[PDB]
């Protein structure tokens, strides 16, 4: 886990709960000696999962909850910072966001060096209302992060209600985690009333 999102995780606890609560969890995650949280440090993914596991005790909010509220915070925080860059990159909307993921992979890497491995595909399961996001990554439980970001930019920006559910989990049986995105444009396009 690169220090950017790792520091954003720290940020989540400090802001929404409190700095006092943060240091309590920091004790439990056995990360009392590690408070750098810088982008080039690259914290072990294990330390991130164990961190949220500790937060699941103190906050009582389970990993899935923390990861989703992380995505929510991440979006609103960036826009709150007043960075107009979020309005330019990723088209500032769900559709562009999804397909521009690999775009920031290269574009933002030129500014912040560091190996970023993107392996993902988006093919609908013969329905349209079911984009199968083929997510190839070892952090299978980091799925809720995607959920918390994508749904937020969808209905809040584009006004389109979409839901992403994990239909396949990376394990020994399957090297890939698959998501299904059910987009409801019938909420907007099917308003033939006046
Ligand atoms: O496998 C995985 O995790 C994902 C594999 C696909 C690439 N993955 C997309 C995540 C993503 C998925 C869906 C939607 C939006 C997403 O982007 C959210 C996002 C993530 C990170 C930053 C800070 C960037 C930064 C990094 C350093 C300095 C400055 C800026 C910004 C925004 C990016 C990524 C790559 C490697 C690592 C790692 O290795 O930890 C972690 C994440």
């Amino acid at each position: 886990m690169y220090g950017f999102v790792n520091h954003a995780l720290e940020l989540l606890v400090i802001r929404n709960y409190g700095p006092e609560v943060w240091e309590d969890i920091k004790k439990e995650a056995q990360l009392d000696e590690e408070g750098q949280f810088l982008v080039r440090i690259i914290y072990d993914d294990s330390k991130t999962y164990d961190l949220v596991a500790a937060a699941s005790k103190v906050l009582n909010l389970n990993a899935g909850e923390i990861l989703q509220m992380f995505g929510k915070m991440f979006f609103v925080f960036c826009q709150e910072s007043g960075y107009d860059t979020i309005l330019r990159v990723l088209g500032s909307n769900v559709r562009e966001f999804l397909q521009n993921l690999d775009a920031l992979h290269d574009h933002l890497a030129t500014i912040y060096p560091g190996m970023r491995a993107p392996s993902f595909r988006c093919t609908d399961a013969e329905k349209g209302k079911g984009l199968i996001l083929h997510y190839y990554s070892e952090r299978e439980g980091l799925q809720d992060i995607v959920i918390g970001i994508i749904k937020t930019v969808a209905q809040q920006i584009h006004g389109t209600e979409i839901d992403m559910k994990v239909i396949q989990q990376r394990n020994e049986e399957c090297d890939h985690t698959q998501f299904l995105i059910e987009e409801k444009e019938s909420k907007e396009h099917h308003h033939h009333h006046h």
Side-chain angles (χ1 to χ4, degrees), residues 51-93:
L51 211 174
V52 299
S56 184
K57 306 192 304 179
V58 182
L59 309 180
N60 193 85
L61 280 303
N62 298 147
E65 299 302 285
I66 305 176
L67 272 56
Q68 287 186 270
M69 68 180 60
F70 176 91
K72 187 61 58 63
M73 183 280 297
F74 186 83
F75 174 69
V76 63
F77 181 82
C78 299
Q79 192 183 151
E80 182 196 89
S81 306
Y83 290 119
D84 295 287
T85 40
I86 190 178
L87 187 67
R88 298 295 70 199
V89 72
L90 294 162
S92 213
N93 70 87

Side-chain angles (χ1 to χ4, degrees), residues 115-128:
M115 70 92 186
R116 310 172 194 197
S119 32
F120 61 92
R121 291 178 57 207
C122 303
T123 53
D124 83 280
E126 295 301 85
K127 183 62 187 178

Side-chain angles (χ1 to χ4, degrees), residues 167-179:
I167 61 176
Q168 194 66 214
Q169 194 68 89
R170 171 177 170 97
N171 285 273
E172 184 182 85
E173 53 180 71
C174 299
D175 176 83
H176 50 248
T177 298
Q178 304 191 92
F179 298 92

